[PDB]
Design an enzyme around this catalytic site. Structure first.
Site, PDB file in Angstrom:
ATOM      1  N   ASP A 122      36.560  40.652  35.994  1.00  0.00           N
ATOM      2  CA  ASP A 122      37.687  41.347  36.612  1.00  0.00           C
ATOM      3  C   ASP A 122      37.768  40.948  38.079  1.00  0.00           C
ATOM      4  O   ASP A 122      36.905  41.333  38.865  1.00  0.00           O
ATOM      5  CB  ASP A 122      37.353  42.818  36.400  1.00  0.00           C
ATOM      6  N   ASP A 133      45.772  42.003  40.078  1.00  0.00           N
ATOM      7  CA  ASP A 133      44.591  42.617  39.488  1.00  0.00           C
ATOM      8  C   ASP A 133      44.586  42.336  37.980  1.00  0.00           C
ATOM      9  O   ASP A 133      45.439  42.886  37.293  1.00  0.00           O
ATOM     10  CB  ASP A 133      44.798  44.106  39.756  1.00  0.00           C
ATOM     11  N   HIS A 202      46.521  51.748  37.180  1.00  0.00           N
ATOM     12  CA  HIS A 202      46.953  52.421  38.406  1.00  0.00           C
ATOM     13  C   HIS A 202      47.999  51.648  39.186  1.00  0.00           C
ATOM     14  O   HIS A 202      48.085  50.429  39.081  1.00  0.00           O
ATOM     15  CB  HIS A 202      45.707  52.567  39.325  1.00  0.00           C
ATOM     16  N   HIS A 210      44.643  50.741  44.770  1.00  0.00           N
ATOM     17  CA  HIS A 210      44.919  51.986  44.067  1.00  0.00           C
ATOM     18  C   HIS A 210      45.884  52.825  44.899  1.00  0.00           C
ATOM     19  O   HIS A 210      45.445  53.630  45.720  1.00  0.00           O
ATOM     20  CB  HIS A 210      43.641  52.769  43.772  1.00  0.00           C
ATOM     21  N   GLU A 235      45.335  48.365  32.648  1.00  0.00           N
ATOM     22  CA  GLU A 235      44.055  47.946  32.093  1.00  0.00           C
ATOM     23  C   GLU A 235      43.618  49.010  31.084  1.00  0.00           C
ATOM     24  O   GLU A 235      43.904  50.187  31.291  1.00  0.00           O
ATOM     25  CB  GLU A 235      42.948  47.807  33.137  1.00  0.00           C
ATOM     26  N   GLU A 330      43.176  43.374  31.279  1.00  0.00           N
ATOM     27  CA  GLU A 330      44.048  43.908  32.308  1.00  0.00           C
ATOM     28  C   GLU A 330      45.079  42.908  32.846  1.00  0.00           C
ATOM     29  O   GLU A 330      44.760  41.743  33.043  1.00  0.00           O
ATOM     30  CB  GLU A 330      43.132  44.279  33.505  1.00  0.00           C
TER      31      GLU A 330
HETATM   32  C1  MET Z   1      36.902  48.839  43.354  1.00  0.00           C
HETATM   33  S1  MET Z   1      37.557  47.214  43.652  1.00  0.00           S
HETATM   34  C2  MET Z   1      37.528  46.608  41.909  1.00  0.00           C
HETATM   35  C3  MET Z   1      38.875  47.182  41.373  1.00  0.00           C
HETATM   36  C4  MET Z   1      39.074  46.680  39.925  1.00  0.00           C
HETATM   37  N1  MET Z   1      39.525  45.321  39.825  1.00  0.00           N
HETATM   38  C5  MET Z   1      40.011  47.606  39.203  1.00  0.00           C
HETATM   39  O1  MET Z   1      40.742  46.977  38.316  1.00  0.00           O
HETATM   40  O2  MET Z   1      40.220  48.805  39.365  1.00  0.00           O
HETATM   41 ZN   LIG Z   2      42.669  47.708  37.948  1.00  0.00          ZN
HETATM   42 ZN   LIG Z   3      40.794  45.072  37.823  1.00  0.00          ZN
END
Ligand code: MET
Ligand SMILES: [Zn+2]
Ligand SMILES: [Zn+2]
Length: 349
Positions: A122, A133, A202, A210, A235, A330
């Site tokens: 990830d 992300d 999120h 986030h 995700e 994700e």
């Molecule tokens: C806490 S930084 C890592 C975030 C992670 N990639 C997520 O998808 O939430």
């Molecule tokens: Zn995420």
């Molecule tokens: Zn992530």
């Protein structure tokens, strides 16, 4: 491309490929934010090329450190890292087995990837704080194939259900229904796949992984609706365990609280570390290996101070019970005025 050539050098006009465009389950308005969608696409293309490369060499026998450094090296080169204008959005998660998220090795970690491991890769890229992300699961033993298919399907279901005016709770219900429709058999034992209820997708904001809204992966959530212009990380996580995660192991991930403003600090080591964080990460997540790389040392107490002050927040590994298996898929989606774009979609997943 050879990977070594920055995405921007592959698209001279600064126009990057769109991801998968979908009609929902304004054209002027959509075009007015073209520079924004474009930045997401540049980051998604880097993401696609980095992961393709990783899938070609990740093998049991490699250390988790070797894997993350090789991936990050490639990501830096393709995103054309430039301070806070372009770079890595967050540390490379490579959570193993019962651990589902937020594990990346700290210095000295001798963990070696095994044939029977189930590893969640990830990682994130950004252009001007526009974050991609996106994650996938790596396995070498076919015994996990159905578990991976379950989660991939659940994630695609959440992506399909998403849209302007859609209730977040409805997206979670849908994901759970698909996820739980799968049953798997691993080492002579059978299980109904369960979504990890306290894990979620999120909303994403500028330099903000986030942004405040969450996308549940089980029924029972909030009826709050998705809105035009929002960006979401969809995700899902499936587990053979309790379907609940708890903090476990050493912490490696950290991130400044987005809402905390300026805080004068006189303690020298703590002040210096905060300055380093502000200069190099701002509100983006980082890990201890990234402080090491910058030549920092003797920073653990300063880091603890910042966490205790609430300036920085720790994000420790999230794991289900010992012996369980977890998987993740994700993508990042853009809720554009004219359509839904699965910006990180590739020919891989
Ligand atoms: C806490 S930084 C890592 C975030 C992670 N990639 C997520 O998808 O939430
Ligand atoms: Zn995420
Ligand atoms: Zn992530």
């Amino acid at each position: 491309q050879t990977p070594s050539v920055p995405i921007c050098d592959l698209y001279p006009n600064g126009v990057f490929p769109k991801g998968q465009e979908c009609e929902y389950p304004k054209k002027a308005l959509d075009q007015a934010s073209e520079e924004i969608w474009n930045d997401f696409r540049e980051a998604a293309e880097a993401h696609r090329q980095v992961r393709k490369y990783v899938m070609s060499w990740i093998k049991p026998g490699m250390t988790m450190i070797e894997i993350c450094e090789k991936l990050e090296d490639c990501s830096r080169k393709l995103i054309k890292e430039n301070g806070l204008n372009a770079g890595l959005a967050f540390p490379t998660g490579c959570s193993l087995n019962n651990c589902a998220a937020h594990y990346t090795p700290n210095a000295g970690d001798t963990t070696v990837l095994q044939y029977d491991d189930i590893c969640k890769i990830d990682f994130g890229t950004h252009i001007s704080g526009r974050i991609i992300d996106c994650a996938f699961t790596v396995t070498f033993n076919p015994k996990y194939d159905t578990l991976l298919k379950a989660v991939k399907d659940a994630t695609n279901t959440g992506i399909k259900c998403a849209g302007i005016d859609v209730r977040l709770c409805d997206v979670g219900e849908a994901i759970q229904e698909v996820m739980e429709s799968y049953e798997v058999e691993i080492d002579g034992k059978t299980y109904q796949v369960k979504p990890i209820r306290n894990l979620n997708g999120h909303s994403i904001g500028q330099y903000r992984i986030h942004a405040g809204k969450t996308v549940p992966i089980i029924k029972g959530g909030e009826a709050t609706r998705m809105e035009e212009g929002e960006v979401y990380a969809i995700e899902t996580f499936g587990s053979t365990g309790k379907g609940v995660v708890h903090d476990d192991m050493e912490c490696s991930h950290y991130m400044k609280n987005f809402d905390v403003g300026h805080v004068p600090i006189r303690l020298p080591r703590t002040k210096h570390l905060l300055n380093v964080i502000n200069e190099n990460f701002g509100t983006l997540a980082f890990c201890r290996r990234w402080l090491d790389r910058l030549g920092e040392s003797k920073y653990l107490m300063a880091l603890k101070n910042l966490c205790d002050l609430g300036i920085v927040d720790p994000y420790p590994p999230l794991c289900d019970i010992k012996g369980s298996y977890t998987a993740q898929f994700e993508h990042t989606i853009l809720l554009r005025p004219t359509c839904k774009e699965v910006v990180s979609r590739g020919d891989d997943y």
